[PDB]
Design a protein around this nucleic acid. Structure first.
Lengths: 79, 97, 92, 106, 98, 82, 107, 92
DNA sequence: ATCAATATCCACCTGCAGATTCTACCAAAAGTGTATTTGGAAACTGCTCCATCAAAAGGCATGTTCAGCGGAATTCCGCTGAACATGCCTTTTGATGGAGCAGTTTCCAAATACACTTTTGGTAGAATCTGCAGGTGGATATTGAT
DNA sequence: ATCAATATCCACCTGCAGATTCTACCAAAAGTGTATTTGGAAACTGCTCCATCAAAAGGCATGTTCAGCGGAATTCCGCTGAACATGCCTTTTGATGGAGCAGTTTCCAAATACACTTTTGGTAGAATCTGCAGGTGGATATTGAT
């Protein structure tokens, strides 16, 4: 049950960097839900690239390639 | 002494907009990755950098999403972000249009 | 000027024997086949590169399909394809 | 001689797909099954859209499938819709849809 | 002396046009606009008829979709009248302004 | 009478577009806002197409030059080749 | 023997880039001018972003450019920002930016 | 494992002589170069096919650059590219 | 609830624009048969680094109290868009030179391919360096109560 | 506007980790130099199909009337921010075993490389054919007034 590790305080900090001044009480569960779908989709592809390489280890490159497929190119980890 | 509601909020915005550390606790995030992954494929290992790459993207995405959300609340002449705003932004973004 | 139109047409007859298709519509299916072909080819292409392979095999097409198509559509696409490679290999 | 499409038991041109893979600069080499598999996947998807586009025409009492029939077929199917989420089908129009709040207050 | 109430015909138009697929902008005027815009990139150009057509199909498709997101934004604000602030918001969230 | 090209894209037409888009009531200011949007849209696409044109040393924008441009703008269009 | 980079008056490696063009399978063949031209464009661009990076660095009293500096440089420049409109610079943060209606008081 | 680091560093020293770059930052710059390289090469690749050409020349690279880069960046990338080719074209 | 006005639906009709089906010419495919080359998998394995266990302590999450004020429901009015019928300028639709789009033939500058030679960009290892994180204090903003 | 509680600003300071810097080894590159191949500019030209012009045609501009929508003003409940007490779980510094990724040699199934023969999918010009789009008629529903 780890989606709860995404605490209310952290989700708040994130909204802050995002420039939000006041946060509804329902935001938190919604955000956890939004984040879970993001991760599932990024991991599904990453892990797909891992398998194709017949590896048991998901590598940063696997994540960098998955992010690129999804239109969310990431700079900094070899990609 | 007690600051009026919203003063610390603004203080926090300036605080976090000025910095770059991730804002989600590391270990908890790692567990969420491992859990979602295991549900896709059992027996999997992660290079530490792979987990950090996923955290950097996730927060980058979530922060971008809140700006849009914030704009949607304000579009409603409100200053409080609510679920319906997150929802209007993803529908427009094309994550469920 | 090559096109997938005749094969498109064949497929149409196995599905709806008594149904026809206008030009503009045939032209849309053609765009559709080329588009998917290019998307799958491309992803297979990268797949190989990431793994420093020189050959795009049926394995690459498969993973590409998994990465490109939606869940159920992928499930079938994958079987259909596996079936075609098998029947092909099992034949003089 | 017997065509590869026949052996693979497909309507789509395996020979052409193979050719198109080579001339496309997707890789140095191209295995023998790749064009088979690829061709098989393109036939299947083609069958899916025509199948639905077809039902779309019968539902409108028409026998000849037109763009409208492909648009109504694609956007009314979750997966095909996602697969073509960034594609515009010319002469397709849109699906009939009016937000509730805009309907006359009965 | 008959008269339909505000909105009655509009809705009727929505129903009408969501049913059809013809282009809704007049061909010639569009063609002029396309050519005028192009003259700014390279002079003495010619356009296949199919190219101008393709462009119109794309443009209407784009605008119709933008009006949809725009209507959603208008609604978000508890209105039923799309305004510029609405096209503006939509285009920003789409990344066209971001 | 003599008006301007973007103005050629008329209110009645813009209204029709908005209708297919499901808009029930249209503010007076929408029309000019739209023209502006439509102009930015065309410039982006045409700029890319004419570039494909010059590259092939032609003097005629071809439907494919437009399809290839649309594809780059992530605005893929089926039906005109490609 | 003079490197093609020097013949071309460039700092970026003309050969490495000609080589990569081959290995990436982009065409049957790659003319000699292609890598010279592409290495220049790559060089011209990294210079441009580094100019802006170093400034941000200077602006924050730092001597060593770090991610935040690259981000600030990219997001504050219309063009680079567009060129990287769908890129995420790790550890870069966002630009300080607070919507007006959120600031207190009036006037 | 090759990277563009040294070259990034040389250019860094040319514009801001007394500034360094941290490791993560250099990593980012390295991602930047590979990214733009791929995008440009890719545009080139298609451009060539669109014209039934099997050779990618300084000219495809140029049009790709015009399609990919914004206003002034493109305007200048092309100068530097042209410049570099003319000079190389005259050195031997 | 009662018509009156219009829009909307449907069953049928039929002309023709566009879809079908025939034929022949054919280069470009695509299949086949032989000779040669090679990518990458199997097998052995060196060695990075991922998982994981332990301990420590304090950065932070959790949970509660309390009330300031933002959201949202309600009333109200001015004004802005919708409907409409009046009338005309524009666009549209069908017909005719010519300008480029391509199809072809040529032949050279330029792109492989192959064999050496030599110069460079990684890096493994140990060593000295240096920018700045993080702690500190105190002088200057910013807030909010009165 | 004066005043006190707090946060913000910030130049000074030095331990520490991450950054710059030699030393040598180098095989992987990148370069220099014949031999062979050919991709595509370049000029010539026939045939579309694009731009232009004139008349069959169908929609847009315009003014007026008012109903109903958007937003200003008012109001009140309650939920969300700020502050505080408490304590645990993240994180941080280290160490260890072993998994599995990654280097290296070996060799065969499979892929490239012509060469030759067969067949097939595209184009072209001719004639035939038909699914359906509008046009009509009459019934029925919808809307708006009373």
């Amino acid at each position: 049950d780890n989606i709860q590790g995404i605490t209310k305080p952290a989700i708040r900090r994130l909204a802050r960097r995002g420039g939000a001044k006041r946060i509804s009480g329902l935001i938190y569960e919604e955000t956890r839900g939004v984040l879970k779908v993001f991760l599932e989709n990024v991991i599904r592809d990453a892990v797909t690239y891992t398998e194709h390489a017949k590896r048991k280890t998901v590598t940063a490159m696997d994540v960098v390639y998955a992010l690129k497929r999804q239109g969310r190119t990431l700079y900094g980890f070899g990609g | 002494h007690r600051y009026r509601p919203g003063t610390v909020a603004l203080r926090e915005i300036r605080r976090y907009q000025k910095s770059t550390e991730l804002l989600i606790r590391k270990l908890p995030f790692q567990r969420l990755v491992r859990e979602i992954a295991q549900d896709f494929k059992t027996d999997l290992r992660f290079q530490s950098s792979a987990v950090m790459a996923l955290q950097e993207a996730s927060e980058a995405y979530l922060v971008a999403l809140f700006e849009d959300t914030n704009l949607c609340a304000i579009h409603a002449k409100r200053v409080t972000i609510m679920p319906k705003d997150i929802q209007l932004a993803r529908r427009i973004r094309g994550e469920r249009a | 000027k090559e096109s997938y139109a005749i094969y498109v047409y064949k497929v149409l007859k196995q599905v709806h024997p008594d149904t026809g298709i206008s030009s503009k519509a045939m032209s849309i299916m053609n765009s559709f086949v080329n588009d998917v072909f290019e998307r799958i080819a491309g992803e297979a292409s990268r797949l190989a590169h990431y793994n420093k392979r020189s050959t795009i095999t049926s394995r690459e097409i498969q993973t590409a399909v998994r990465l490109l198509l939606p869940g159920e559509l992928a499930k079938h696409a994958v079987s259909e394809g596996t079936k075609a490679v098998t029947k092909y290999t099992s034949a003089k | 001689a017997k065509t590869r499409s026949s052996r693979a038991g497909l309507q789509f041109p395996v020979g052409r797909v193979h050719r198109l893979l080579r001339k496309g600069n997707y890789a140095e080499r191209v295995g023998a099954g790749a064009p088979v598999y690829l061709a098989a996947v393109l036939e299947y998807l083609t069958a899916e859209i025509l199948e639905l586009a077809g039902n779309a025409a019968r539902d409108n009492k028409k026998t000849r499938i037109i763009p409208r029939h492909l648009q109504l077929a694609v956007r009314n199917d979750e997966e095909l819709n996602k697969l073509l989420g960034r594609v515009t089908i010319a002469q397709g129009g849109v699906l009939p849809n009016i937000q509730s709040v805009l309907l006359p207050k009965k």
